Amino acid sequence: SNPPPPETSNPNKPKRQTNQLQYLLRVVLKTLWKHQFAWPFQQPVDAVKLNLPDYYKIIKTPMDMGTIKKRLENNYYWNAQECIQDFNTMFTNCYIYNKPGDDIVLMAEALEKLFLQKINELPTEE
Ligand SMILES: Cc1cc(-c2ccc3nc(C4CCOCC4)n(CCOC(F)(F)F)c3c2)cn(C)c1=O
Numbered sequence: 001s002n003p004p005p006p007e008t009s010n011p012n013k014p015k016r017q018t019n020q021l022q023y024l025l026r027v028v029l030k031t032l033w034k035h036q037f038a039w040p041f042q043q044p045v046d047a048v049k050l051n052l053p054d055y056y057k058i059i060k061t062p063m064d065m066g067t068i069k070k071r072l073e074n075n076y077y078w079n080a081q082e083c084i085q086d087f088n089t090m091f092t093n094c095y096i097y098n099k100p101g102d103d104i105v106l107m108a109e110a111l112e113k114l115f116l117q118k119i120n121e122l123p124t125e126e
Contacts, residue, residue, distance in 0.1 A: 003056050005044045006063060008070040013078075019126040020080035025072040028087075028118045033065060035114065037107035041065045041090060059097060063090040080122070087115055 032038055043066040047055040056062070063086050070076070077083050094108040 002044070002046060002048050003062070006067045008067060008076055009074055010076070013076065015075040016078055017075060018080065019123055021072060021077060021083065023123055024080060024083045025069075027121075028115065029065065029069055029072060031114055031118055032111050033069065035111060037110055038065065040104055040107060041111065055097060059093050061089050062093060063087075065090065080125075084119065091115075 033042065041064055044062060044064050045052070045055055045059075047053065065087075068083060068086050068090075071086070072083065091108055091112050094104060098105050
């Protein structure tokens with residue numbers, strides 16, 4: 001079976017809204033989410049559907065943009081670094097699991113190049 005997805009709401013975890021988190025939702029996530037290659041990354045890796053019985057024996061910290069979108073829209077995060085780390089983990093998971101040269105890796109690398117551009121433009125905290 002698939003594991004439960006990463007949590008997106010937890011009453012015990014404090015949260016805030018900042019201009020950097022709003023930029024991560026309206027600019028960074030929005031740019032990647034609408035990209036032609038977004039869709040393998042728009043929901044948790046479905047190892048059952050994809051017939052990957054080893055995926056969740058290898059990847060300890062799965063992450064995907066559907067999870068990140070909900071985390072931002074429902075204020076799961078305290079700071080922008082947590083969200084940036086989620087994006088970074090999503091990319092490195094892809095590079096750990098897949099063969100170099102697989103199409104999913106080329107897709108990840110195109111999204112990552114855009115992510116890096118957008119994050120360098122992160123606004124000073126207001
Ligand atoms: C290992 C891994 C896999 C994927 C990933 C995620 C979702 C995917 N949905 C499909 C197809 C399956 C058949 O029904 C139509 C959709 N593929 C297969 C085609 O993917 C491709 F287009 F990219 F080639 C999916 C693959 C996502 N990350 C992050 C992975 O590491």
